[PDB]
Amino acid sequence: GPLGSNSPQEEVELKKLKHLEKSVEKIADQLEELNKELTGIQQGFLPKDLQAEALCKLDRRVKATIEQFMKILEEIDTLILPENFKDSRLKRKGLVKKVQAFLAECDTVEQNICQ
Amino acid sequence: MSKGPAVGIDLGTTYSCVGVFQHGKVEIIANDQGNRTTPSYVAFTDTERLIGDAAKNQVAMNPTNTVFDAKRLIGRRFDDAVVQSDMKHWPFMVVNDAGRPKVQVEYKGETKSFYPEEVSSMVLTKMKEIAEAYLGKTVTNAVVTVPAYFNDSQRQATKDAGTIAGLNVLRIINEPTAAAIAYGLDKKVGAERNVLIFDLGGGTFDVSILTIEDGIFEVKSTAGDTHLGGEDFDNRMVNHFIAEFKRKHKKDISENKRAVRRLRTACERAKRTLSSSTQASIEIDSLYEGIDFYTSITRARFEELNADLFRGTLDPVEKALRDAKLDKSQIHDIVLVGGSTRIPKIQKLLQDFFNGKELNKSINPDEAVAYGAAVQAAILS
Ligand SMILES: COc1cccc2ncnc(N[C@@H]3C[C@H](CO)[C@@H](O)[C@H]3O)c12
Ligand SMILES: [Mg+2]
């Protein structure tokens, strides 16, 4: 529709997306920590049996991270944004792609440990 | 904490509900998450045991050690056909302990087995704690509901679950009787009343014919489908969308579990929108291979995708009427129980079958059984 037609209604949608962006950042931090813990197990002195257990506790935490990212996608999917909500639509698309890039990172971890 | 009142608990296959009659009205109690129903789910993890919403919320992470449907097992023999048929669809393992089924899980790193009444007791403990958290008083007395088709063993196994949960099970009442009590059908002036309870909720379909005379509830017949509910209606919308995505983009999203899940979650919400609106829109960004899926469905299309399933609900009604030896015109009252009875087409089919007869549907369908159990609980308090 028109240009320079930012509405108060769209501010409400942008606020929902900004909360979601913030939740994604916290989940992402958890992913990075899991990544440090993985390197930690690989570069530590755990014998084979205890290493298997530590990687499986790590696996359950990576599955939890994946679930949180999936719950964010399902929350973003409840949004209906009018075509004129260009800023919200761009932000929704960018956040979904960012979550999908994080999911692909979770999958490299998850598929490579405790199979 | 001081001593509180008696509560009514609806112990469902997939969800449970607790109610309390106070200040002249029934109050359905919300759980710690603000939900008026709690999943009948128990999760066993390396570090803890989770009940209700916390157990369901981690099912995708820990499928094998998350138990649900204990109601389909409670009071049954291992070799029961229902047990044998059902265990092919459960991700958790069911073992034979000298003729009795047990669910085998991994709990705190160890292989552990639990009887169905022990799983149901953890669910009942959760309902007790939900009542206590709201009332700020100790809850010991309860009226617990069971399906009318339940046998002596199944009824006793439910009472034992109440006992193990630390509850004083004042009365075990049939679900259609509780539904009839909620609408005060026993308090209607006249001769004996024939009541049809149409229960479509929590993955089961149950039809029951009751005759109420001088407050004596009599179950003339029971019919239904063990497996039928909202999940089936959801799947049909999922199939419709997968086919639409193939026609529009020439891509099959069926093998991508995450894409199918996003779609299934959106369909279940669209289905709910279709119960009060004639159209629902869905917008899913980057659903599969970076493709945005923006679409809509009419109530009419949803009804056509489910026509056999919706029409199929009348066969049990016809079977129950034949077993009760009654004509459809002899049914004084019809009661809707279960969340899927909110579907306009199901309501339309049943009212048309009953020749324009008004349905008792003003009480939330998901809460009607707990509501009737709470009224009964207050009469016994
Ligand atoms: C809260 O639920 C609803 C609210 C409003 C309309 C609904 N229409 C259909 N199913 C509903 N609920 C279904 C009940 C059934 C229980 O296992 C589920 O499949 C729900 O989707 C509706
Ligand atoms: Mg793994």
Q: What angle do CA B130, B134, B135 make, to 5 degrees?
A: 115
Dig out the tokens for B8 from the structure.
């009514």
* Nearest bound ligand to the CA of residue B14: 1
Residue A65 is inside which H or E element, if any? helix A48-76
Its domain, for residue A35, covers 1-115
Residues lying with their CB under 5 A of ligand 2, a single-atom ion:
A 59, 110, 114
Residue B278 sits in a domain of what CATH number? Answer: 3.90.640.10
Length of chain B: 381
Dig out the tokens for B61 from the structure.
């992470």
Q: What is the CA radius of gyration of chain B?
A: 21
**Do B370 and B325 reside in the same domain of the chain?**
no
Tell me which of A30, A68, A96 to substitute to probe the interface with B (most B C-beta atoms closer than 10 Å).
Answer: A96
CB B285 within 8 A of CB B292: yes
Residue with the two structure tokens 């761009």: A90
Nearest-atom index, ligand 1, CA of B201: 16
- Report the alpha-carbon distance of residue A39 to residue A5 in Å, rounded: 50
The torsion angles phi and psi of B231, rounded to 5 degrees, stand at -55, -35
Contacts made by residues B33-37, CB under 8 angstroms, sequence distance 24+: B36/B364, B36/B366, B36/B367, B37/B12, B37/B366, B37/B367
Measured between alpha carbons, how far is residue A29 from residues B77, B93, B126 in Å? 49, 35, 33
Length of chain A: 115
CB A113 within 8 A of CB A62: yes
**Do B105 and B214 reside in the same domain of the chain?**
no
Cβ-based neighbour number of residue B82 at 10 Å:
12
What resolution in angstroms, rounded to 1 decimal? 1.9
Contact list, A81 vs chain B (CB under 8 Å): 283
- Report the alpha-carbon distance of residue A30 to residue A24 in Å, rounded: 10
Secondary structure, 3-state, B68-116: CCHHHCCCCCCCCHHHHHHCCCCCCEEEEECCEEEEEEEECCEEEEECH
- β B42-44/B49-51 pair status: antiparallel
- Report the alpha-carbon distance of residue A94 to residue B11 in Å, rounded: 44
Dig out the tokens for B242 from the structure.
């997968």
**Do B319 and B302 reside in the same domain of the chain?**
no
Partner B, chain A 45-104, Cβ-Cβ below 8 Å? 57, 60, 63-64, 66-67, 70, 73-74, 76-81, 92-93, 96-97, 100, 103
Its domain, for residue B198, covers 188-228+313-360
**Do B325 and B222 reside in the same domain of the chain?**
yes
Residue A23 sits in a domain of what CATH number? Answer: 1.20.58.120
Residue B97 CA, ligand 1 centroid: distance in Å: 37
- B13 annotated to a ligand binding site: yes
Tell me which of B33, B56, B261, B285 to substitute to probe the interface with A (most A C-beta atoms closer than 10 Å).
Answer: B285
Distance between A106 CA and the closest CA of chain B, angstroms: 13
Q: Do B285 and A93 touch (CB under 8 A)?
A: yes
**Do B92 and B181 reside in the same domain of the chain?**
no
**Do B25 and B161 reside in the same domain of the chain?**
yes
Q: What is the DSSP string of B206-234?
A: EEEEEEEETTEEEEEEEEEESS-SHHHHH
Longest CA–CA separation in chain A, Å: 65
- The closest residue, in CA terms, to atom 20 on ligand 1 is B230
What burial letters (b/e) apply to B169-185, b meaning 16+ CB within 10 Å? Answer: bbbbbbbbbbbbbbbeb
Dig out the tokens for A60 from the structure.
């359950």
**Ligand 1 neighbour B103 (Cβ under 6 A):** no
- β B42-44/B66-67 pair status: antiparallel
Residue B116 sits in a domain of what CATH number? Answer: 3.30.30.30
Nearest-atom index, ligand 1, CA of B203: 17
CA-based nearest residue to A30, from A63, A77, A74: A63
* Beta-bridge mates of residue B194: B211
Q: How far apart are the first and last CA of chain B?
A: 18
* Nearest bound ligand to the CA of residue B366: 1
CB B244 within 8 A of CB B295: yes
- The closest residue, in CA terms, to atom 7 on ligand 1 is B272
**Do B92 and B79 reside in the same domain of the chain?**
yes
| Count of pairs with CB atoms under 8 A, one residue in A, one in B | 45
CA-based nearest residue to B221, from B238, B205, B237, B209: B209
**Do B242 and B334 reside in the same domain of the chain?**
no
Q: How far apart are the first and last CA of chain A?
A: 51
CB A100 within 8 A of CB A49: no
Q: What is the domain count for chain B?
A: 4
Considering B312, B341, B371, which residue would you say is the last residue of a domain? B312
CB A76 within 8 A of CB A20: yes
Q: Do A57 and B281 touch (CB under 8 A)?
A: no
**Do B51 and B136 reside in the same domain of the chain?**
yes
**Do B241 and B305 reside in the same domain of the chain?**
yes
**Do B92 and B28 reside in the same domain of the chain?**
no
Q: What is the domain count for chain A?
A: 1
**Do B257 and B224 reside in the same domain of the chain?**
no
